[PDB]
Design a protein around this nucleic acid. Structure first.
Ligand code: ZN
Lengths: 119, 119, 101, 128, 226, 65, 220
RNA sequence: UAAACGAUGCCUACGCUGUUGUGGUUAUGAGCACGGCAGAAGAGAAAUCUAGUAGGGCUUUGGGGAGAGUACGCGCGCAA
């Protein structure tokens, strides 16, 4: 649930000279298995040649808009230096709801409606 | 534009089917009931839900809303049906009818006070 | 590829047909292919009938009408917006248009 | 004009596909009779009536559920007894069942009877 | 870790209760709409082989969007075969999808003898033809101990179906692996349904097993409710 | 076994794959026109059903009986 | 001949008042066998009574063949013909569908609340086309009431009757209900309860029901 | 010589339904010749269907793009 750890796992694997695809797929599994309800990963740079591009991946639920983004969403950014230039890495994770308030917010999102069962 | 939005109409529709007998023609009764039963986290939403529910309750009690089954009004419609029609085709035993039908009556030897249509 | 089953014209069981000339540009077009339009127009405009009622010498008067059949080539009919481009399923619908005035 | 033995075959093949049980066939010759009589011996067709109309001739026939297909060959090739198995393997679906019909000095016979009687002939048609 | 199966369909209730056999299913032409039904009887025995993997593309404003398409066969080397295709963002996901289609389209395949009925049946019964797109395949019976005279893709299919000798011929654009696979499976299938001379006398009649077991199912209705 | 189903109206086998095949069951009338425990049973292929031909064919066969 | 529960004079009379026999003007090669002459004044085709009774008896017979009657599904997606289904199904123990038949609701497991059919019943099958189409995926027979103008591929038992009038719809459903009950021994004679039931099924406007309410209350 | 085109050779077969024309004939129910239209089933790479089924008979005709329907010879034409 810490994006600053996972981004450094990614940065390591670039220096270990391992494909971005395999590295990112592993990161997403770790984030989801640890209980994150979704995440976003983007890699950008001179990644596969002289023409630069960025590759972005999305899994599960991610919030972008309003006050619910400030309480459920966590972000980190890093960069790795290689012989050809700098490659930039962005990671974002959406925290789980947690009734004891350790892993994420106590109260679920303001727009969710739940109707109680009948006796 | 004053349209209610999807969660507000959905919660409105579910509550009237789940608790129908508890509701009345009064906004303040209906606001008390949704304050009592529901999880809704802002007065801004429950003012809109109770608004739509008291907008339905008129149309529903006025001989029903199609797409909204209420057991209390299935019973009311059974009472209206149990108020049985006393009209009758049953006494219309004397009849006149066309020749082709009179020959079908002949070819199957059907007894009764039939006549050729005088027309 | 073949766009229409009838080749865009009404000729069947014939070799050849008479030509007619387009009202807008005088191009020759075969009679069985030309776009046709009917007109029935009063000699006197609607904005004058209330003056006619005080101008005429007769006890009552019926305004004379004028009658026309007009012919158009494809290019002119599309440009003047008598007809429009239509979707692959709409192309098959056939209905009689109004008489103009 | 169409060949009468070809006409016979298409008439019964189409009617079988359309799931009819009986047909009328409109122009008949001597070998057409003998062909139909062959299909009756092997139980491919059930009932045959011939109409003597003084205008060529016509037949009415009842089909069985066992008939999948039949056909005529044109032209009618001459074959030695050495040749018939080549045609058998070309026309029929299996080594176990079906009939290839051959005309001979001993009438119409099937590819098994050719071995029994020790005779070739001319190839006529098939059914299975 | 595993999930228990709750049968979604009426026939599904009968298999779990153990009131039916796989021959009875095929014999009455009943639909299969739950893959678990095939697992229940054959899970311990099914083999599979991937015939083709290929990449497909859709052009968009941003660029090509792309997916993996996989085609495979499920079969048991004795009697049963089925063919399935799936498309997904991932080669693993695609295999999971293809397997569902395959299981929902299993068929029993009949066999016969080239000559006399000595020993065990080993070839297709009758010469037959199967067509799919531009591709046509014809199968012919073969003497015992000839083996499978067959092209690259079709050879695997005959093996999984438990056929020992065949002769094959082919026409059309056989590079298209999906068409060649489907056409060859139709060829053997068509041979099994040929109207053999004995068939009319071999005929038997029975009431449908779903009507036959209605009483039990009505008890199960009330048991679920109570 | 897996290969013993035959269509009553078209006299050919029904393949395991045919989603449109169906089996029709009917009771037999009693003395004084009531019901009984015995059943008529018919197996019918999809090919007749796509055409529409089954309506007349069944009426024929109930008369045959 | 076909073994059919006997006609009785009041029943015969009943159907004729209910106008069951008035077909439309058109006819179809499938339905020629049920017509017996045409009205010289009106070009309306007239339905054969003796055949109508026969196929009504044949329908009843096969309804009896299926245990756990809940597995019979009766559908009729129209007002002007609604309430008939709602009562009819209760008289035999069947399940019913009333509104729009959600397409895929036999095919697809996710759509709740409709059972896998073992026999489907339809009235006025120009509407409910989807129902006839969809039953074909799940090996179910189909029984329909039909009229000379319309023709169907997958219907096994076509009961011929007027389907475009509220007098007529009531008559078919009311009679068939009784037969099915009779065949099982739930009732001893069919003429028992004519004007009661045939009226209950017959459709009525809100505007009529207001008038009838006021009348009834005055009488009470 | 023509996009001389429905870009679909000529005889002869076997083949589902509804509707609308033209000319004769009619037990007034319908037919025969020549058409248009809308579905179906099959077919086909599809679009669609003069294209369904098939070892029926006879003639013309194609064999990856180009160079080329061009060179040489020959036959017709006043020339083109
Ligand atoms: Zn112009």
């Amino acid at each position: 649930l810490c994006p600053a750890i996972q981004a450094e796992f990614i940065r390591s694997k670039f220096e270990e000279n391992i494909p971005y695809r395999r590295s990112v797929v592993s990161a997403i599994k770790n984030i989801k298995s640890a209980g994150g309800q979704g995440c976003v990963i983007e890699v950008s740079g001179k990644l596969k040649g002289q023409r630069a591009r960025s590759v972005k991946t999305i899994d599960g639920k991610i919030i972008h808009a309003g006050q619910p983004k400030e309480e459920f969403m966590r972000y980190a950014t890093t960069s790795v230096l290689l012989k050809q230039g700098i490659i930039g890495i962005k990671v974002g994770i959406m925290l789980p709801q947690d009734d004891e308030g350790i892993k994420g917010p106590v109260y679920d999102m303001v727009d969710k409606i739940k109707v109680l069962p009948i006796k | 534009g004053q349209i209610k939005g999807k969660s507000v109409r959905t919660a409105s529709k579910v509550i009237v089917e789940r608790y129908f007998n508890r509701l009345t023609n009064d906004f303040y009764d209906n606001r008390n009931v949704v304050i009592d039963v529901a999880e809704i986290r802002s007065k801004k939403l429950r003012n809109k839900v109770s608004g739509c529910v008291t907008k339905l309750y008129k149309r529903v009690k006025k001989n029903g809303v199609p797409g909204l089954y209420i057991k209390e009004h299935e019973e009311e419609r059974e009472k209206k049906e149990s108020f049985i029609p006393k009209i009758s085709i049953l006494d219309e035993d004397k009849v006149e009818v066309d020749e082709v039908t009179m020959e079908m009556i002949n070819q199957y030897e059907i007894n009764g006070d039939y006549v050729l249509a005088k027309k | 590829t073949k766009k229409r089953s009838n080749n865009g014209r009404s000729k069947k069981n014939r070799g050849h047909t008479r030509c007619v000339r387009c009202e807008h540009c005088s191009a020759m077009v075969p009679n069985d292919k030309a776009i046709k339009k009917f007109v029935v127009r009063s000699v006197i405009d609607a904005a004058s009938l209330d003056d006619l009622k005080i101008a005429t010498i007769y006890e009552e008067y019926e305004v004379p009408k004028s009658y026309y059949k007009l012919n158009y080539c494809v290019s002119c009919a599309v440009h003047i917006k008598l007809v429009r481009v239509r979707s692959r399923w709409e192309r098959k619908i056939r209905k009689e248009q109004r008489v103009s005035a | 004009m169409m060949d009468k033995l070809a006409n016979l075959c298409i008439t019964i093949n189409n009617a079988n596909r359309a799931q009819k049980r009986s047909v009328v066939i409109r122009r008949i010759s001597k070998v057409c009779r003998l062909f139909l009589e062959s299909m009756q011996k092997h139980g491919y067709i059930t009932d045959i009536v011939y109409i003597d109309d003084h205008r060529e001739g016509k037949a009415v026939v009842g089909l069985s559920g066992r008939l999948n297909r039949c056909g005529a060959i044109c032209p009618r090739y001459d074959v030695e007894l050495k040749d018939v198995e080549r045609y058998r393997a070309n026309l029929l679906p299996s080594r176990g069942f079906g009939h290839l019909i051959v005309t001979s000095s001993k009438g119409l016979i099937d590819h098994r009877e050719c071995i029994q009687h020790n005779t070739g002939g001319k190839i006529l048609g098939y059914f299975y | 870790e595993e999930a228990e199966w709750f049968p979604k369909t009426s026939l599904g209730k009968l298999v779990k209760a153990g009131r039916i056999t796989l021959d009875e299913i095929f014999g009455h032409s009943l639909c299969i709409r739950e893959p678990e039904i095939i697992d229940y009887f054959l899970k311990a025995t099914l083999k599979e082989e991937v015939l083709v993997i290929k990449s497909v593309q859709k052009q968009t404003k941003a660029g090509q969007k792309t997916r993996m398409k996989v085609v495979l066969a499920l079969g048991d080397h004795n009697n049963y075969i089925g063919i399935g295709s799936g498309v997904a963002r991932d080669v693993v996901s695609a295999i999971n999808a293809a397997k569902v289609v395959a299981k929902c389209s299993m068929r029993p395949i009949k066999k016969g003898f080239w000559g006399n009925e000595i020993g065990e049946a080993h070839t297709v019964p009758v010469k037959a033809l199967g067509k799919c797109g531009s591709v046509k395949v014809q199968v012919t019976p073969a003497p015992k101990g000839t083996g499978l005279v067959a092209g690259g893709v079709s050879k695997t299919i005959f093996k999984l179906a438990g056929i020992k000798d065949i002769f094959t011929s082919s026409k059309g654009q056989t590079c298209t692996t999906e068409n060649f696979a489907r056409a060859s499976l139709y060829a053997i299938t068509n041979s099994t349904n040929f109207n053999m001379p004995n068939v009319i006398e071999e005929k038997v009649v029975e009431l449908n097993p779903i009507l036959k077991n209605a009483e039990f199912l009505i008890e199960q209705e009330q048991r679920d409710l109570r | 076994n897996s290969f013993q189903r035959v269509c009553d109206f078209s006299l050919k086998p029904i393949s395991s794959q045919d989603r449109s095949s169906v089996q029709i069951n009917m009771v037999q009338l009693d003395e004084r026109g009531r019901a009984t425990k015995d059943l008529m049973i018919f197996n019918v292929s999809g090919t007749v059903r796509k055409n529409g031909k089954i309506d007349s064919m069944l009426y024929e066969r109930i008369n045959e009986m | 001949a076909v073994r059919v529960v006997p006609l009785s004079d009041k029943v015969a009379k009943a159907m004729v008042q209910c106008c069951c026999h008035l077909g439309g003007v058109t006819s179809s090669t499938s339905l020629k066998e049920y017509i017996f002459g045409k009205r010289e004044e009106d070009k309306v085709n007239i339905i054969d009574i003796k055949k109508m009774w026969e196929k009504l008896n044949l329908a009843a017979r096969m309804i009896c063949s299926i245990p756990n009657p809940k597995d019979i599904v009766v559908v009729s997606s129209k007002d002007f013909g609604r309430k008939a289904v709602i009562k009819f199904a209760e008289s035999i123990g069947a399940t019913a569908v009333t509104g729009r038949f959600i397409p895929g609701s036999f095919s697809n497991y996710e759509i709740k609340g409709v059972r896998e059919p073992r026999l489907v019943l339809v009235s006025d099958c120009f509407a409910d086309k989807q129902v006839v189409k969809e039953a074909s995926y799940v090996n179910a027979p189909c029984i329909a009431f039909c009229n000379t103008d319309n023709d169907i591929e997958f219907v096994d038992m076509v009961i011929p009757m007027n389907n475009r009038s509220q007098s007529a719809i009531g008559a078919g459903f009311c009679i068939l209900s009784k037969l099915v009950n009779y065949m099982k021994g739930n009732i001893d004679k069919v003429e028992d309860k004519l004007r009661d039931h045939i009226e209950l099924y017959t459709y009525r406007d809100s505007d009529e029901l207001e008038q009838l309410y006021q009348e009834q209350k005055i009488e009470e």
